[PDB]
Amino acid sequence: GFELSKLLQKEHQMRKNVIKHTSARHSRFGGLLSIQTPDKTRLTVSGSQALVDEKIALQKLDDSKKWNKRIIKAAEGLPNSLLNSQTGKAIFFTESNGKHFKEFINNFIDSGFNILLHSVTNYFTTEQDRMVTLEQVEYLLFFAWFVKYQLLRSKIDNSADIKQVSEALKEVTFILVSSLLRSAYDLKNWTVTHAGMIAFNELLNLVSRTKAATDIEFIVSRLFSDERIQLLSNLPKIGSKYSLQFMKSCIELTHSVLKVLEQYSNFQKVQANYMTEPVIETYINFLERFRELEDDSIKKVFSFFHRVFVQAKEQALLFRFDLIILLREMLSPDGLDRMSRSRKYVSQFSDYFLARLKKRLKKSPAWFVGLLFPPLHNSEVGFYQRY
């Protein structure tokens, strides 16, 4: 009941948002408005609120226009799971059922997990060539769930321990998850690529747990041979085309990957490998659907933008116009809540962004035309363009 009342407060806030765009007097009372541009050309818009609010008038003017550009669209042949559904939607339990299910999987983890994974993983190394898509996706989404659950339970309480899931780290299983991701990526089978992405994310998270406590550094050094850096750097670039879940998986994997190599102390070589146009394209394409996303993913995105803009000082990437629209949409009274933690990050970013943009634009007025288009790759002018 308490959380229901709080949710009703949120409903009242949405109702308030609708009221702030609602006229007082009725729908046939309305007059007419004319707006004159520079060069003395005039437009026409109706409605009473347009008389007072120029922002609403400008938005309403463009909203009447008919056309929208038609749009491009990755997975089939498998029942519903995390791979192709929005998992921000729980399934609901009785109190007895909740405790009974918790008891079952807790006893399973404390009793059966390591022995089961050892047997099934030393099966599949001898049988990888003969596999079918079901068994790959099954293995990769059993791994992930149980490793993640044990990490959260030991985050909560000291009675649990991480040794219960420790069979995942030993070398054979690491090779097998790597091989599945490899073979799936090469043949362009994107569903198994997604599932392998999720599993490899959980392996890296578990490694970052155990290093915060011998062989694990050896496993890290073998996990980050140059070939794997090429693959893991390649991955976010292709994500621009695909469904929303794919891009989110890419983002979270990228965050974990870069953080582990931060705590390795090579680093400057690796980070420069990541920073270029198509990754930024994926990041902006993902970020503009913020109304569907969690509070945490936006923190991850703006962590990456802080890394690009402030630390690496590769400022030229973000001077592109569709980002400037997004900050208006997300920062306005329209979008992100006035008191959510996101607004702190967003405003603190936008201030510095516009400061540096002011400096750049006054130093070289050519960037006014630059802001519309991608950067220019010519040798003789491009170097001064980027800096």
Partner: protein
């Protein structure tokens, strides 16, 4: 499909009209009225046919032939309201006194539209939209006299008289209260910011719903049209009914009646 000859050419009568408006006197009579119209002091012009008969007689006595305009406008009265209006618009003098022109919405709208055309270049609208006056004919004096001077009872108005100018005697039975009637309707296009007009004559009409303007079309701007009262033109309307005197009804018959329409002042 077929065609015929007729004894009347309207060019000659138009020339006679424009001479009559600028020459006749009892300065000339009607130029004073048109000056008052230009000054926004006067709303209606009443044409006397006695003046036209006098003008014809005087022109004849000066030794020149002239068309009998009086019978011409009695025979086919409807067409000549347009000819006189065009002549008045052509010959209208400029104002004598300041007017405070900015009170007129139509002036602002047409000035801005002309400026839009001027910038673009770096009939426009129907002439009825800017006629600030009304016009009526007054029949011949019987003591100078023609059918228009001789009253008819409501029974004597046969089907021969359709189109002519006549006089009727009788008692009024009922009168309606005033309500507006459209003459020219105005619209606004939302996307391209351009205005269009429509003229109404029949008892009913279909409003416009697509901006067919060539500039709007060539930009492929399939905008929406909306009606506006603030730049439309109305005119007052009233309907009545007249009925023959009871002491003129023949024996055994029921009295008859006619419908009358009234516009303007």
């Amino acid at each position: 499909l077929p065609s015929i000859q007729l004894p009347v050419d309207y060019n000659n009568l138009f020339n006679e009209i424009t001479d009559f408006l600028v020459t006749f006197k009892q300065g000339p009579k009607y130029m004073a009225m048109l000056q008052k119209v230009a000054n926004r002091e006067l709303n209606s012009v009443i044409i006397d046919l006695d003046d036209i008969l006098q003008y014809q007689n005087e022109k004849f006595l000066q030794g020149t032939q002239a068309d009998d305009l009086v019978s011409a406008i009695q025979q086919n009265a409807n067409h000549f309201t347009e000819l006189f209006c065009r002549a008045i618009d052509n010959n209208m003098p400029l104002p004598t006194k300041e007017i405070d022109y900015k009170d007129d919405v139509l002036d602002v709208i047409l000035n801005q539209r002309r400026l839009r055309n001027e910038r673009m270049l770096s009939e426009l609208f129907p002439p009825n939209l800017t006629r600030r006056y009304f016009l009526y004919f007054k029949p011949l004096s019987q003591n100078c006299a023609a059918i228009s001077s001789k009253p008819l009872s409501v029974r004597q108005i046969k089907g021969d008289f359709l189109g002519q100018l006549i006089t009727v005697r009788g008692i009024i039975t009922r009168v309606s209260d005033v309500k507006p009637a459209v003459e020219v309707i105005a619209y606004t296009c939302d996307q391209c910011g351009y205005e269009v007009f429509q003229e109404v004559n029949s008892r009913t009409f279909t409003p416009l719903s697509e901006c067919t303007s060539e500039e709007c079309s060539q930009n492929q701007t399939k905008g929406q049209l909306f009606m506006s009262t603030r730049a439309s033109k109305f005119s007052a309307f009233q309907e009545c009914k007249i009925q023959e005197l009871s002491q003129q009804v023949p024996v055994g018959h029921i009295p008859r009646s006619l419908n009358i329409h009234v516009n303007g002042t």
